[model samples]
Target: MFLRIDRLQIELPMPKEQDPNAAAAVQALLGGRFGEMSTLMNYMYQSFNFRGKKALKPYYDLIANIATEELGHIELVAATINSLLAKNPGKDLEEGVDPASTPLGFAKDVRNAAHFIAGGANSLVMGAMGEHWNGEYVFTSGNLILDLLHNFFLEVAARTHKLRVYEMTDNPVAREMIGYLLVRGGVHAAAYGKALESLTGVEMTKMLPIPKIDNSKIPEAKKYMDLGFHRNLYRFSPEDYRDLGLIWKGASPEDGTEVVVVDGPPTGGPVFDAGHDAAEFAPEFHPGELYEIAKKLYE
Candidate 1:
């Protein structure tokens, strides 16, 4: 029923330095109340519970297509978080010089200890402050109008949170992912606005660019917008969701650019290697023993 890609939505630049605090903050984008998890689950459930698909194929197509994209969004955010903390201890996984020194002592002061203690210096399905993402954040009311209204609000709210996180940190890996997301999220908001307008004859797009700051103003976002990413809604399938173009057509309110529906997923970049976590005991106990076994299996 779905496909998986080994690449990220876009290529993320390597981080200059490991910053656990910034990684912790980026967690909110991954699993917080208005994070990618919420967006993915919200639209996913809506599409699954969607009724009248034969009568309103366009709306069903739009929601289902966007939901697939959101699934990738969660992966993107998680990759950013993992890259930020990749070299958390600032040391390679080797026998140390001093027996008295604790190699991972720095983790004690990190904002979220679970990242190190439980998650092996990897990303968690939790908020910036360490609250695990929960299903309570999803809102699928079964009413088409109400569902569209809530989706619009959710996109705006998600965009607002992304902007705030951008302000709080200056990491490139984080910014690159967020910037690209801003452009894509803008499209989702506009798409929903257009969907609502088609049903009610109201100009819902008039309240766009919600935080009042244009995407072009942000350098990272501007890069994608320059390529017209702001106006494209990817169909993510070979021949399905055909009616997606019906609601997604027209010039964008932000720049009057012609909005179009792309036939397939973006040609994304390769997933970055997060490397192994030396801090964890499973690997630390017999470091290369498992790797040796894996290598033999390659034959």
Candidate 2:
């Protein structure tokens, strides 16, 4: 059983304003082929299908624990996208102005345009190309060693995609989310390496640094990695999976700092309040002011 936390993995800063395109791009991290959903589901399925639990107790424990943590990662990415998309939904409240003459018309082709036209501005499950996320992205082979190797590759691929997204935009909210994920994702990458080494005596340590870039290079990512956050393996379950520390020990590959397994997930910060968007007349108004004025007359 997993224990739920009433907080986020990190404090997400308010995005400058709603950018449907940016939010669409961020959706790839949440549900793309190499996104957090894929990582979470792949590990989750493998851990569930694991055999010989009595003999390979530690390995099972590690995969199980990391799988739980991936759940939190998914939530963190989704929340970040939601915040980035939250814009002034009421921007076109004025009557007599043609809806096509306002900015709302320009948003028609954007992903989740209804979020700007109907719902409060927020992220959806579509990619930059507006493709809806699906479960076909998951890959579970029921083979422990193979699964671990796949996870290692998955983390590396994810890291590359994140870095690219980070370069694509300078939004502080997106950057902050990417930074936190980069650090945490690094930990998972290391965890899978350790798991593979523990089971097969393979020196997966050589793969130590994926992305071929240092976490310290990014200031947003440096803050947490510098504090040894990358070395910690959090047990997401209430009281189980504490033995994950056994394999998470030794020095961090990045800086050789002594590793530690935090008993529970980090106490994250509060979710940001996505305020109402007044420009699009969202949630309460439609494109025509004549309609709103007529409704108010009836009330």
Candidate 3:
């Protein structure tokens, strides 16, 4: 069983103003064809379908462990969307400000307009163009080598998407999210390469150093890497999945830091919804009176 944590993978900085377009773009990382959902589900299914587990225990362990980590990536991306979409009092949707006006209009064109319109301006599990995420993106071949190859490609594709998105905006929250993902994703890529090498005796490590860019170039990613976050593989649950760490060891391919297997989740806190702005009229909330009542009861 998986142990649930209310805390986020990392704290996302609030944006200066709501950017529905950026939120839309971030959605691709969450729900798109090669998104986190795909990674999480693919490994999850592979782990379940794994045969000869007693013989290939380490491979199973590695895949299962990485699957758990992907779930956290999903949460991180969602939090980023939330922060970027938070309303800005200065930009009024009613006034039709340039960029703000366009995002406010997204309330009509996008799915879950509540997020952009009725709810806090944030990212949703939809495509960049505003379509809802579907389940067809997942791929589990049941063959170990093929699955590893697919995972390697998926991480590389994800890395490309992150790089493109980072280039699209100077937003700190988005940059930090992308930076962290890049570092962690690098670990997964290396892991799969190591797995392939172990299984086939044909070195696949040369295929890596992909993206051709160093994580140190991104300051946000550097912070985590400095703390050896890249080398640490977190066990998602409290009691289960601890042995998976046996496969997550050795030095990192990029920086040669000693890879450590963490038995529990990160020590982060839960993220809460602040409340939507009615001035934008996106996802309509209960009215101020209802909100006040909730605050009184909860606080």
User: Which model scores highest in TM-score?
Assistant: 1
195-269, model 3: which lDDT tens digit per residue? 887788866767666778877877888898887788877777666655655556676877776788777778865
Ranking by lDDT: 1, 2, 3
- TM-scores of all predicted structures: 0.95, 0.85, 0.83
lDDT of 2 by residue, 234-255 (tens): 7777777767877888877778
Residue pairs with backbone overlap in model 1? none
Candidate that beats the other on lDDT, 1 or 2, i.e. the better one: 1
The TM-score that candidate 2 achieves is 0.85
lDDT of each: 0.88, 0.77, 0.73
Clashes of each: 0, 13, 10
Among all windows of 10 consecutive residues in model 3, the one with the lowest summed lDDT is: 88-97
Number of the predicted model whose lDDT against the real structure is largest = 1
Q: Which portions of model 1 miss their true places by more than 4 Å?
A: 88-100, 282-286
Question: How many Å off is the CA of 164 in candidate 2?
Answer: 0.5
Give the alpha carbon lDDT tens digit for every residue of 220-295 in model 1.
9999988889988999877789999899999898798788988899999878666555555524533577767878
